């Protein structure tokens, strides 16, 4: 039809990609997708609440921790409802439900509607005890009162949804590279090494012979694998390289139709820099014209007790116990095996265990099948994500493996799933077909919610824009989901997108027109002032969400408040008025766009900050920590929120001591009294610094990016601490002498602040090693899909030292102690340092 020819432009703008495009294919498994993904999404449209849906109330089923608990301090919660500009202050108790505070209301007001929170695109509807919305969780956590406007539900009818309706060796022909162009080097060697790969697992390894390195180079041979045909198990990758390691390729063996690939292939290869997630995609190169290729043929037909003595279980216990990154042994390996059974009544031993497979052994796979219907503990076992997702990772290309992870996944409610999003959309990419559960999980959560919803979409349109290894395959999700998400939410995303790019524009060519002689130049805050004003009229759409906080609904720019950094890379900080007028406040919405950093590092540091929090909550703790929000929208591009109030520790050191490097220790405590208005505020702020001083340290060290310069570090004038810039003699994290003249500590002392300080660490570090193997794993997830290029081992294995695994409780609180002590040791050193190697 007419209309759905030019639906399909729309999407295709908003997606970024052309999915409709077969041009970079071999195959049809992306149509074949988009046709898969019509059931799983035309269901779940089919299945959620248009009301509910509508409103979409960000919700918990968690405790309210404790340190929330000591601000209501005697079970009783104030609201303060509005009308037209008339308000009245309601008392309610934490488990009064949305619907119990209306029926009361009406009793408190004598001579239907829902209630929104002020200036936001946010409500507080459905059955939930109150102390359960989000919203007031951080109204509490923050201070503050909780402000409503008394409207109707935004027509359910708004997101009304467009309508659609055997026993051979296995053999592989190498003819040969070709190159159209390559004068790469005075010429070297060059081979071609095709791997049979199934999870990262190398199951047989044939090569050619090594020649010199010609733009055209041929063999013409059969490269006879050891594995047989029907050996072959679903999700095997055939793997083709070139070494002199300088390209590589991925072909799926078996099809998603349970099909053995036969035939001719022409497979244009990707280059490495001159492991990593990318290593891994089926996708070829689109670049059809200066890529490498490699020519081959496929001519080869579908798919086909309890007794244990105790030595023996201590040792298979001692390695079930064992951390997600310990290597398992050959023995170790045959002893999982052997004892399969009494393995499977322990789920903590499933990554170990089905990674004990011999996966390129057909009734041993046929085994480990009849195995997992025996999934009584498995289903009936608490949901571990650290567990989840380490079956979700490089180490299971099998179906049924992952299959049940994502079973695990379903229990997860909305409010933990936004905490695992960004994660599980990373780990699309091992998934070694574009239909999997994984990938139609996230349709389901992500249709049924618009908080997941929104996110979604930025985070596969971050990378669709960004890779060539995995845009078509994310964007095949990307066009599924915006297909269900319905009319209203592609009008947000339609304007979302128009200002981002227009707001791009604007950075890039500000960029341009100043050299490395950093000054911000009085021509290019003309050059500025101008083009945004240019862009206010007929250009900017009236208003738009936030992409990083889809609550707030952004209006005109602030023009005289927009500026650029003096800094070798230009980037803009630009103000927004809120275009809800029944906003409690005229504060503006800053965000600060950003060119010459990969963003899609600062999205992964970022989110397992918040997952931090929110195992900090488990044990009611609160450390302050400030992740501000951060997008990437496309090649080394992206935004960031703005987080009022704040400057940064360098500035702090500039204005009163100087700039070549010189440092003073007061300052830190000067600034702080000076920005409050009363000297009980200013305990506030000390009480906050602490807290937000130690949350940073701990979580940094952790990450092993706490060796940080001043100039990327902030603080609020309320002394929130914050590091920023996750861009990319060492010291373990940042303990200055400034921040310790806070603590009240002259080098040697120990006040009631700092004896806190040391307190508060230990706490947050050994909460942190309760939860041990989510870190490692997310880290590890972090490593392989969003970095330069890691190793399968040094780089992974950081995190074991730090979180010190296998160490006692006791141990672990004295090494921790002792990193502060290097800290107390150094003081400045490599703070300077800096700038020493400025001109060494
Ligand atoms: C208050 O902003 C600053 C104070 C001291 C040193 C640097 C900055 N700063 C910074 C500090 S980094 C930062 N990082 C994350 N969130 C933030 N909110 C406010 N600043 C940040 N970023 C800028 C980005 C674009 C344009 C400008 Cl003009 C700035 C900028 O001035």
Partial sequence: SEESQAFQRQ????????????????????????????????????????????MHPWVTSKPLPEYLWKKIANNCIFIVIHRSTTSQTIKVSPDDTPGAILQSFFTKMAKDFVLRVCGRDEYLVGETPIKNFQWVRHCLKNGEEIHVVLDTPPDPALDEVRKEE?????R?????????????NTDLTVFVEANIQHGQQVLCQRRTSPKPFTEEVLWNVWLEFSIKIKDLPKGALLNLQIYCLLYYVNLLLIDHRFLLRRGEYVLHMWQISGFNADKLTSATNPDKENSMSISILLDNHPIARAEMPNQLRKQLEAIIATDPLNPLTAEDKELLWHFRYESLKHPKAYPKLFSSVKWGQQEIVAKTYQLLARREVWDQSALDVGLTMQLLDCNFSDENVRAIAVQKLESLEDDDVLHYLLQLVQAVKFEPYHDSAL???????????????????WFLRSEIAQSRHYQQRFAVILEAYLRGCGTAMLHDFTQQVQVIEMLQKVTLDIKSLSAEKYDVSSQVISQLKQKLENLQNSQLPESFRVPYDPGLKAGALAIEKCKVMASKKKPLWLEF??????????????????????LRQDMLILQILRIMESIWETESLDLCLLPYGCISTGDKIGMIEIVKDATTIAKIQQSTVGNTGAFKDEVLNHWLKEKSPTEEKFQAAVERFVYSCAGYCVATFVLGIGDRHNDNIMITETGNLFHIDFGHERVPFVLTP??????????????????????????????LRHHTNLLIILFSMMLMTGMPQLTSKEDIEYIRDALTVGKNEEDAKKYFLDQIEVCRDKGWTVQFNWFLHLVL
Avoid at 166 to 170: A, G, L, M, P, S
């Fill in 577 to 598: 008025k809120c275009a809800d007028p029944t906003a409690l406040s005229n504060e503006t919405i800053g965000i600060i766009f950003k060119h010459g950093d990969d």
């Fill in 738 to 767: 400034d921040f310790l003249f806070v603590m009240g500590t002259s080098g040697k002392k120990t006040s009631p602040h700092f004896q806190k300080f040391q307190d508060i660490c230990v706490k947050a570090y050994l909460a």
């Fill in 172 to 184: 592989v022909k190498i003819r040969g590279i070709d190159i159209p162009v390559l004068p790469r």
């Fill in 11 to 54: 999407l295709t703008a908003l997606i970024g990609y052309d999915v409709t495009d077969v041009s970079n294919v071999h195959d049809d498994e992306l149509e074949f997708t988009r046709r898969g993904l019509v059931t799983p999404r035309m269901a779940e449209v089919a299945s959620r609440d248009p009301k509910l849906y509508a």
């Fill in 439 to 457: 990938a139609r999980f996230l349709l389901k959560r992500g249709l049924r919610n618009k908080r997941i919803g929104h996110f979604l979409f």
């Fill in 166 to 170: 055997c026993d051979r060796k296995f």
